[PDB]
Scaffold this active site. Structure first.
Site, PDB file in Angstrom:
ATOM      1  N   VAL A  49       0.823  -1.208   0.000  1.00  0.00           N
ATOM      2  CA  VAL A  49       0.000   0.000   0.000  1.00  0.00           C
ATOM      3  C   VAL A  49       0.858   1.260   0.000  1.00  0.00           C
ATOM      4  O   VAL A  49       0.395   2.337   0.406  1.00  0.00           O
ATOM      5  CB  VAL A  49      -1.023   0.019   1.152  1.00  0.00           C
ATOM      6  CG1 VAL A  49      -2.017  -1.123   1.005  1.00  0.00           C
ATOM      7  CG2 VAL A  49      -0.313  -0.061   2.495  1.00  0.00           C
ATOM      8  N   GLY A  67      10.879   3.579   4.449  1.00  0.00           N
ATOM      9  CA  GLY A  67      10.380   2.217   4.447  1.00  0.00           C
ATOM     10  C   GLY A  67       9.220   2.103   3.487  1.00  0.00           C
ATOM     11  O   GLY A  67       8.792   3.087   2.876  1.00  0.00           O
ATOM     12  N   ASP A  76       4.517  10.494   9.950  1.00  0.00           N
ATOM     13  CA  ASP A  76       5.801  10.985   9.464  1.00  0.00           C
ATOM     14  C   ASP A  76       6.177  12.328  10.099  1.00  0.00           C
ATOM     15  O   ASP A  76       6.816  13.167   9.465  1.00  0.00           O
ATOM     16  CB  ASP A  76       5.864  10.989   7.934  1.00  0.00           C
ATOM     17  CG  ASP A  76       5.869   9.574   7.348  1.00  0.00           C
ATOM     18  OD1 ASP A  76       5.658   9.420   6.125  1.00  0.00           O
ATOM     19  OD2 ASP A  76       6.052   8.609   8.119  1.00  0.00           O
TER      20      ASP A  76
HETATM   21  N1  SB4 Z   1      -2.222   2.201   4.882  1.00  0.00           N
HETATM   22  C1  SB4 Z   1      -1.561   2.658   5.948  1.00  0.00           C
HETATM   23  N2  SB4 Z   1      -2.166   2.583   7.156  1.00  0.00           N
HETATM   24  C2  SB4 Z   1      -1.492   3.060   8.200  1.00  0.00           C
HETATM   25  C3  SB4 Z   1      -0.208   3.566   8.085  1.00  0.00           C
HETATM   26  C4  SB4 Z   1       0.350   3.620   6.810  1.00  0.00           C
HETATM   27  C5  SB4 Z   1       1.689   4.180   6.571  1.00  0.00           C
HETATM   28  C6  SB4 Z   1       2.834   4.074   7.331  1.00  0.00           C
HETATM   29  C7  SB4 Z   1       3.114   3.355   8.587  1.00  0.00           C
HETATM   30  C8  SB4 Z   1       3.777   3.985   9.644  1.00  0.00           C
HETATM   31  C9  SB4 Z   1       4.035   3.307  10.824  1.00  0.00           C
HETATM   32  C10 SB4 Z   1       3.644   1.999  10.920  1.00  0.00           C
HETATM   33  F1  SB4 Z   1       3.878   1.328  12.081  1.00  0.00           F
HETATM   34  C11 SB4 Z   1       2.993   1.337   9.914  1.00  0.00           C
HETATM   35  C12 SB4 Z   1       2.725   2.022   8.744  1.00  0.00           C
HETATM   36  N3  SB4 Z   1       3.845   4.817   6.732  1.00  0.00           N
HETATM   37  C13 SB4 Z   1       3.337   5.338   5.641  1.00  0.00           C
HETATM   38  N4  SB4 Z   1       2.033   4.987   5.482  1.00  0.00           N
HETATM   39  C14 SB4 Z   1       1.299   5.532   4.324  1.00  0.00           C
HETATM   40  C15 SB4 Z   1       1.274   4.624   3.110  1.00  0.00           C
HETATM   41  C16 SB4 Z   1       0.809   5.407   1.894  1.00  0.00           C
HETATM   42  N5  SB4 Z   1       0.283   6.725   2.274  1.00  0.00           N
HETATM   43  C17 SB4 Z   1      -0.704   6.614   3.356  1.00  0.00           C
HETATM   44  C18 SB4 Z   1      -0.060   6.126   4.639  1.00  0.00           C
HETATM   45  N6  SB4 Z   1      -0.316   3.152   5.746  1.00  0.00           N
END
Ligand code: SB4
Ligand code: OL8
Ligand code: CA
Ligand code: CA
Ligand code: CA
EC number: 2.7.11.24
Length: 344
Positions: free
Chosen positions: A25, A31, A163
């Site tokens: 996603v 990352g 972020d």
């Molecule tokens: N779909 C989704 N849901 C929740 C978070 C994220 C997420 C994280 C992230 C951060 C910390 C963590 F522990 C897990 C995931 N970092 C970037 N994204 C993005 C991925 C694409 N843009 C929207 C959010 N993405």
């Protein structure tokens, strides 16, 4: 736990059997992220695999910084941690870090793109951003690059900031003091960004779509007016000050004449957020009390953060010291209860 391997985004992920049906996603800061099904709780989660977390002293401290920050964040409008794991069985094998949070389907760009939002809905979205910012700012954490793509949103318009406190990026939402490298700034850099986001939610177009930093500055000054000499005090570069001082003077626009048809309370809030004088900019906590959010505001449910120890930021340590500290934080992580909320 038994781990399994799966190639995702052209690289091997190694995850506990607890997490199933991984699918990509998108990228996050340092990352990439997969949606997954948590078989322990039946909840949908997002798993971020950090990219090369210990490849350099920059990556290693960034990894520690991100894990420490996410372990501290416990607020419904801020990304926090359900889990953190590594396939490593010991510090000596430790080279990969995975962070788990509740799954959010979209970002704010998915909300406003194909939908004329009602004012009640805009209130809810901006209210949530401000509630999250009040929390992070109370721990002396600033986002500094708040923008729609850093606001995760689910299918019910619930929103979380991500972020914070950490490729060509958009600068359209950045505070002038950040974009132009002014000598000092405060937490209200993020409030400028909120104003830019809120404006776009009300009009359906970018407020300051500058092609470069000078074009963006000109667009900003056209709305807010030429600043006084006292603002030059903040700018180190003489070439930059001379240029700004040389610009033809522009009056501040009346925002009521700009955001035609908007709720007058929305216009008033924008006037308080979109000011160049960052010491006169409204704070997150003050904005939450603004009448624009009257139907949502609830002082019992706008909490501040526990104190956050950032003393590590001033320290230079070796890569293996950051790695060991990170390993300690992985091992010591305590998952939150599944249900941490109660009726008011
Ligand atoms: N779909 C989704 N849901 C929740 C978070 C994220 C997420 C994280 C992230 C951060 C910390 C963590 F522990 C897990 C995931 N970092 C970037 N994204 C993005 C991925 C694409 N843009 C929207 C959010 N993405
Ligand atoms: O002109 C535009 N938007 C605009 C400009 C100025 C004002 C408002 N506005 C409010 O501020 C609130 C309702 C509304 O239409 C909307 C536009 C979007 C896409 C193409 O053109
Ligand atoms: Ca309430
Ligand atoms: Ca109450
Ligand atoms: Ca409950």
């Amino acid at each position: 736990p038994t781990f399994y391997r799966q190639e995702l985004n052209k690289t091997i992920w190694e995850v506990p059997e607890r997490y199933q049906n991984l699918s990509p996603v998108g990228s996050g800061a340092y990352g990439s992220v997969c949606a997954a099904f948590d078989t322990k709780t039946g909840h949908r989660v997002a798993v971020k695999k950090l990219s090369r977390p210990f490849q350099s002293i920059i990556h290693a401290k960034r990894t520690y910084r991100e894990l420490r920050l996410l372990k501290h964040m416990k607020h419904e409008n801020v990304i926090g941690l359900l889990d953190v794991f590594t396939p490593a069985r010991s510090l000596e094998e430790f080279n990969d870090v995975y962070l788990v949070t509740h799954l959010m389907g979209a970002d704010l760009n998915n909300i406003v793109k194909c939908q004329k939002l009602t004012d009640d809905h805009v209130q809810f979205l901006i209210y949530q951003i401000l509630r999250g910012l009040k929390y992070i700012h109370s721990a002396d954490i600033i986002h500094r690059d708040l923008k729609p793509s850093n606001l995760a949103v689910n299918e019910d318009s619930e929103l979380k900031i991500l972020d914070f406190g950490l490729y060509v990026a958009t600068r359209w939402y950045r505070a002038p003091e950040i974009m132009l490298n002014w000598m000092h700034y405060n937490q209200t850099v993020d409030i400028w960004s909120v104003g830019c986001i809120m404006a776009e939610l009300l009009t359906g177009r970018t407020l300051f779509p500058g092609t470069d930093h000078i074009d963006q500055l000109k667009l900003i000054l056209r709305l807010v007016g030429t600043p006084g000499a006292e603002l030059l005090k903040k700018i180190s570069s003489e070439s930059a000050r001379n240029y700004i001082q040389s610009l033809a003077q522009m009056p501040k626009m009346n925002f009521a004449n700009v955001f035609i048809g908007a709720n007058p309370l929305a216009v008033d809030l924008l006037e308080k957020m979109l000011v160049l004088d960052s010491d006169k900019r409204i704070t997150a906590a003050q904005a939450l009390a603004h009448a624009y959010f009257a139907q949502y505001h609830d002082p019992d449910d706008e909490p501040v953060a526990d104190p956050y120890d950032q003393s590590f930021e001033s320290r230079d340590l070796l890569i293996d010291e950051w790695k060991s500290l990170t390993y300690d934080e992985v091992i010591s992580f305590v998952p939150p209860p599944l249900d941490q909320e109660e009726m008011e």
